[PDB]
Amino acid sequence: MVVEHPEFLKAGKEPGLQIWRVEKFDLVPVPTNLYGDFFTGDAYVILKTVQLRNGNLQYDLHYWLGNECSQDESGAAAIFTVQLDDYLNGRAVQHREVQGFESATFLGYFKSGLKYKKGGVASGF
Amino acid sequence: EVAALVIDNGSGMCKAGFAGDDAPRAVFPSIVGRPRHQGIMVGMGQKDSYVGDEAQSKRGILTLRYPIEHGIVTNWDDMEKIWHHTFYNELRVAPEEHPVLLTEAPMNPKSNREKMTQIMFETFNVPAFYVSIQAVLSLYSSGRTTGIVLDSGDGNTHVVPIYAGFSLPHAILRIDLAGRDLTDYLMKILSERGYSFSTTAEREIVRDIKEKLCYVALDFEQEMQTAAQSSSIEKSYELPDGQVITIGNERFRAPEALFHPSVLGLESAGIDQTTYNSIMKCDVDVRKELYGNIVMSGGTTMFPGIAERMQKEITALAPSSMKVKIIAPPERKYSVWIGGSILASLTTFQQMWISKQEYDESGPSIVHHKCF
Ligand SMILES: Nc1ncnc2c1ncn2[C@@H]1O[C@H](COP(=O)(O)OP(=O)(O)OP(=O)(O)O)[C@@H](O)[C@H]1O
Ligand SMILES: [Ca+2]
Ligand SMILES: [Mg+2]
Secondary structure, three states: OOOOOHHHOOOOOOOOEEEOOOOOOOOEEHHHOOOOOOEEOOOEEEEEEEOOOOOOOEEEEEEEOOOOOOOOHHHHHHHHHHHHHOOOEEEEEEEEEEOOOOOHHHHHHOOOOOOOEEEEEEEOO | OOOOEEEEEEOOEEEEEEEEOOOEEEEEEEOEEEEEOOOOOOOOOOOEEEHHHHHHOOOOOEEEEEEEEOOEEEHHHHHHHHHHHHHHHHHHHHHHHEEEEEEEOOOOOOOHHHHHHHHHHHHHOOOEEEEEEEEEEEEHHOOOOOOEEEEEEOEEEEEEEOOOEEEEHHHHEEOOOOOHHHHHHHHHHHHHOOOOOOOOHHHHHHHHHHHHHHOOOHHHHHHHHHHOOOOOOOEEEEOOOOEEEEEEEEEHHHHHHHHOOOHOOOOOOOHHHHHHHHHHHOHHHHHHHHHOOEEEHHHHHHOOOOOHHHHHHHHHOOOOOOOOOOOOOOOOHHHHHHHHHHHHHHHHHHHEEHHHHHHHHHOOHHHHHHHO
16 A cells, blocks of 8 residues: 555556566566466466456455575565555455465466476575 | 665564575674673773673673563663664664664564654664564565464564464464573473583573474373483583583473473463464464464474474364464574565565654654554
C-alpha cells in the first residue's frame, strides 16, 4: 500500500499471468515470451489474475523457489509476495512453490510445462 | 544509495551490520561495563564505560550490566550506551547518515517501542527508522510467509504463529526458560559429577561445553541407559589448565529441560507441547501450514538432535493425517539479523521507513501502526 514501485503499479490490473524474477533485492519483470522458463538458481513471483462474475478480480500469488537460489532471493520473494498481497488489498492467496514440489494449480498455468534452467542471476548479498 | 544499518538486540548477544550483508559484521555480548571507581592510566580504568567484548575482558575492574531482559529494555541509559558503541565503534558510522532497522521481542510494550523510536530520532538523529518483530524476520529468511517460529535465545523462548506475513498475537506463547537457564543447569549437574564451575570464566567453560558437546536425545530413555552402560556417549573436554575431563549424559540431560522444564523446578510446558498449544490457538484453516512450517531460530535451538526430536514429539500430537515438518536452518543463530538485512535492502522497502519528517510532526506514537 505505501509501496512505490513501477511493477506494483502494473500488478493485477487485468486478467492473465504476470511473472517477475528476484534480481538483487529488486522485482524485475520476466519477458512474456520466456514465461515458463525458470532458473533453478533464482526465485520468482507469479501472479495469476482472474475476473469474477461480480466484477472483482481474483488473485493467486505464487512465489517459486529454485533449488539453488540464495537466501536473499528466496527471502526477497517471500517478502515481495506479502507486499504485493497487501498492495492488492489482500484479495490474494499466497502459495509457496518449491522447485520439484510445484502445485498442480501452478503447473496448470503453463500449457507446455516448465523449462528448468541451470544457473541464474547472482546473489544480491 | 546508503546502506541501512540492521541491529538485532538480543538479551545476551547483539548482532549488528549493514543491510545487504549476508551476516552481521559485529556480534558481541549485550553488556555495559562501568568502573566500580574509575582511574586514568592504561589498565587503571580510564574510560567511564565499556561495552561488549571489552567490558567482558576487563570485568576484573568493571561491574557489568545487561540492559535487556527477555528482549525488553530495562535500563534505557545503558541501552543508549550500547547503541552508541554499536554505531561509532562496532560499525564505525555516524547514525544520522543511515536508516536504522531495529528488532523487538514479541509482546514488547508500546511504551518501550515509542521510547526506542524517540532515542533513535532525537538522540542519534537517524534519517529513517523501522522496528521489526524478530520471529517474522526469521520466517522471511527461511523463505516463507506462513509458519510458526520457535525463537529460543538467551532470555526468552517464544512460539510465534504467522499467517501470510502477519503474526497472530493471540496465539503467541512464551516458555520462561532459555539459553542462560540451560547454561546454569548444566553448570549444576556438572557440579554433581564432582566439579566446580562458579566464576564467570568457569561458567563460560560450561557455556562452551553446552554449545560444543550437548545434544537432544531422540528418546530420553534409550539414551540415559545407553550412557549408563556403554561409555559410547562419553566425551572428553580439555580445560584451560589443560587437564581433560569427561562429559556423560549431562550432554543430553541439560537441553532436555527444553522439553521438560520441570527439571528446572519450572512449571511450564516444554517447547514441543507449547508449539502444539499455540497452533491450537490458531484458526483451523491455518493449523495445517503451521504444522508443515515449524521454523527454529536462535542459539538455544542449535542443539544437535533438537529438530529430530521436535518432529517426533509434534507428529505425536498432530492429527495422523497431518504433515509435520521442522525447519532448523544451519544459520539460525543469525536468522533474525539476516531477515532484516534482506528486508531493508529491498527496493520496495524504501518507502516503508518512518521518516525524520513524519516523526517531527507526529512523534513516537506513530511507530506502532507504521511498523505493523
Ligand atoms: N551451538 C549452540 N548450542 C547451544 N546453545 C548455543 C549454541 N550457540 C549459542 N548458543 C546459546 O544461545 C544463546 C544466545 O542466543 P541468541 O543470540 O539467539 O540469543 P539473544 O538474541 O541474545 O536472546 P533473546 O532473543 O532472548 O533476546 C546463549 O545462551 C548461548 O549459549
Ligand atoms: Ca540466483
Ligand atoms: Mg534473539
